[PDB]
């Protein structure tokens, strides 16, 4: 029971940390759904709503 309580406390602490983290030149950023589609110089593909671009 003590172990279970400790685990619950740890989970609560993790949740609190996550909440804290959440709380913490062209511009076409997106308030909507859809992501821009980006690649690194190796061709791996990534996605972001950030629309801050430089040429």
């Amino acid at each position: 029971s003590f172990s279970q309580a400790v685990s619950g406390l740890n989970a609560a602490a993790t949740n609190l940390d996550v909440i804290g983290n959440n709380i913490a030149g062209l511009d076409v950023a997106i308030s909507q759904n859809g992501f821009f589609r980006l690649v690194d110089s190796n061709g791996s593909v990534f996605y972001s709503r950030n629309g801050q671009f430089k040429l």
Partner: protein, 91 residues
Amino acid sequence: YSNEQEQVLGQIVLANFANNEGLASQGDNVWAATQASGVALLGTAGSGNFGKLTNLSKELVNMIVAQRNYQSNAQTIKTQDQILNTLVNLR
């Protein structure tokens, strides 16, 4: 350089092991390869195995549980000794 030119001087290598748990701690956060860890397999940051260079309560609780268990074990031992002493005096 001050002539507005650059020269490549080298490239840092990274290493990975099949079993990091097998590495021999040398103190600080320095390690030696062993038979248990396997040989180092080398590469570079941003290629193959390696990504680029970047540029507590539960533990305390576990320790408390351990200390507790040890105390219980000590109590059991002390009790066992008391029983032995009573038997010896019984003849």
